[PDB]
Amino acid sequence: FKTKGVLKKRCRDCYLVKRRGRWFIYCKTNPKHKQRQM
Amino acid sequence: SSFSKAPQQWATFARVWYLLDGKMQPPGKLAAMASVKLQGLHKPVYHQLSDCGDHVVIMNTRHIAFSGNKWEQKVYSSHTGYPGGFRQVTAAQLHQKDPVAIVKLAIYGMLPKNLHRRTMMQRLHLFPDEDIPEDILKNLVEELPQPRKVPRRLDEYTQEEIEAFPRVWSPPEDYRL
């Protein structure tokens, strides 16, 4: 996970989800694409 | 109008006991009227140096309600005075611990900040549910109207009222629920 100010999908497999009052990027194929909006 | 002097004066400055139901009410709106009655600002004879202020009995305090997310956001802070004795507590926690706390702090916050505040806090009586010492029950003159109108849930409505309100849209018979 990386906390970022701007979220963007790094591949076609990333999906974008709102949890715990934040936005997130989860990716099943490349876990390295995980992002948490600050 | 014709009374002797002593009983006249006694009647005028008489203390009165009000009852206030708290179920589903915001602690603030409760505390507003509680405050007014406590200071005796509802009496045309009011003055700051006259002791006039009335007893207020608030009940069902446990069932108090909080608009918005305040249960989560609002924090009550206090400090024991010892280093590292600073304590912040979410309203939910405080209320979970001591049912009377929330409404009490609100009322204590809305009274004037002088010394009389400590006295008129002694004329406040807070009960978490409705169990009241019969002693205090026998003092009650009247019950103040609750400051928030409580909306009924869906199961509270009579079938008459349910059928009296229009079906707004017509669902397709194919669609599944």
Add this chain to the structure above:
Amino acid sequence: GSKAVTRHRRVMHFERQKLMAVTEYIPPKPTINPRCLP
């Protein structure tokens, strides 16, 4: 005192703030929304 032009956005004299707040754009509001019209 600060130069007329500056980097940091320069707090206005209060009266000027009032002036700005009064003169804000007000969009015309139709009596009926064109969408809920036929």
Add this chain to the structure above:
Amino acid sequence: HPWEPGSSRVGLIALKLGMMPLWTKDGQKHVVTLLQVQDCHVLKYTPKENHNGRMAALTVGGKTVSHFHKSASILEFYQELGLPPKQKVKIFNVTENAVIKPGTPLYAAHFRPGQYVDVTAKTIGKGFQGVMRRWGFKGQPATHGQTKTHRRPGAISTGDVARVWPGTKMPGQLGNIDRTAFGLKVWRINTKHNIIYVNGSVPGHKNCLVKIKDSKLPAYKDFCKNLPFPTYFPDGDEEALPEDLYDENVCQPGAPSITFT
């Protein structure tokens, strides 16, 4: 009543005698405290709702004292009881199935060897003490040119705060005050003189009174089921106890004189 799982017994009031060595079959040496129960009676009973709203409260008396030097109120209290006045009186929280009748004697056999107890007393009064003995501050060095500072607390606070905080450790009274030793094993019981041999050291000066109960430490919680419970009654069994009761790890005053093999 029979023993329920979450139940708690009465305690005792004993007299700290002194200390003694004692050995265990593994060869190790322990030191024990002798606590003698002198005259112990339950005095009054406060029911559950009248006290904590949780547990009942028994009141227990310590050793006998002179009539003459107590107070009228107290003398009346014992008068209506029928005991002579007790020196020390303490209160025990008790589950309502454990209650006894005021005016009942309590003996040392109330605790069986191997068990854990808690002992409470006033610690040895060391009086008004400095900051080194009371707290354990280092002092300042003795010799290298320090002037009149060798013991003093040093700086007592911050510059900005401009006051000194309420917690601050400072010279003051040390020791006459109540503490509790926990998790003490009881090794031996002398039934003739009513003496409990506890493990380690118990707070108080020798010959002071002391308050014993079962250990409230979590590990030992349910240990009560094997114990004489409401309490011990030398009357009821109609069979005497041995002079002494021992734990199974204890080398006795006469014995094989251990040989490893």
Add this chain to the structure above:
Amino acid sequence: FREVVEILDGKTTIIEGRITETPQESPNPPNPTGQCPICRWNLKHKYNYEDVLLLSQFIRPHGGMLPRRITGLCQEEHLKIEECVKMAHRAGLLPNHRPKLPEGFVPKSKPRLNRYLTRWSPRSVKPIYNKGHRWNKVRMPVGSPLLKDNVSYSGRPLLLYH
């Protein structure tokens, strides 16, 4: 309203659709030319989170919102109704629209805190420890800004933050 039934008989499973009776739109709407369901009943800017009789008409027996193209709501009003339904759920209205789970009714939790007009979800909100002074103040949201166009009889605008 179409129920789907499933039966297990002797290592053969039967799944079949079955149609029940759907209640119909009430006979005489006030603004028949009106496009959207809310609007032809003149309910625009009138219903609040508090009006359940209206809200329960769009949702599922298990409590979730009905999709828009089925209902036919103007997009804006759909969003409004959704907000209101969330708020109403949280307020402890519509107790019968939850899913039924025979085990979980038994394990009590601390009695439900009474709340109303709650914009966020209780689990998602950090306690505000720092408040802040008069000039920079952290305000606590109440109700939703989607409703800021409701008709005000007092004339003062609704207070959305305290």
Add this chain to the structure above:
Amino acid sequence: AAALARLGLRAVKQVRVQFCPFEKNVESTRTFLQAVSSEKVRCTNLNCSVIADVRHDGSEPCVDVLFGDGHRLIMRGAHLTAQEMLTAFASHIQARG
């Protein structure tokens, strides 16, 4: 049709689809047919046959699927939606097999 390919249809014996083209309600069953008949699902196992029964009069569309659990899953699409049939098919025929 993609969710069936991922799920390894090889646990199935015989799949037939009986429907009546001139009825108004048969679109769902047809969608199911074209989802099972696709090359992915068809090539997951060659031991499975897919039969299309086409009648005018039968008037009731149906889907019957046998598999090696000794199981027979019969779903009658009438008022059933395509992806409801496919989801039922998936959770039924995968979890068992």
Add this chain to the structure above:
RNA sequence: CGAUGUUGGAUCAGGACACCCAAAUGGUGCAACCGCUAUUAAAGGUUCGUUUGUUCAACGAUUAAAGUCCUACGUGAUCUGAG
């Protein structure tokens, strides 16, 4: 400026968290052991010596670790006076 006595130590430490250790996790060019990163967490810890007046710094030996800082570069009506 009709005085707000100044470096480093000593003593006692109050606080922040931008975490050095202890706890819970995400990512790895993460096989394992090590690591490198990132999130959350401040209740408790954070060594002894040789030389320098020294803070830094070098070096010896260790540690679970030998944190970064604020407090009139905390603390001289408590000490020191090497500078």
Add this chain to the structure above:
RNA sequence: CACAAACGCGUCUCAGAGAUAAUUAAUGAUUUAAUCUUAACCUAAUUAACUCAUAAUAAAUCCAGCCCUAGAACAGGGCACA
């Protein structure tokens, strides 16, 4: 350790439950698939704090003298055996 004591370099003891953040999951709508949900309902797994069980204290008013393992003073414990 030349007072009967004080003392360390010596001896003894030291704890349950709830609560959470990040992060993982289960059911499932808006968006009849999905989806841990600033959607509901029940939910699970989960740091430290922090609360709390529990423990401690807890007899209103005899007190001249004298003694004290109690104490600066004031207080406090003893003074019927023997």
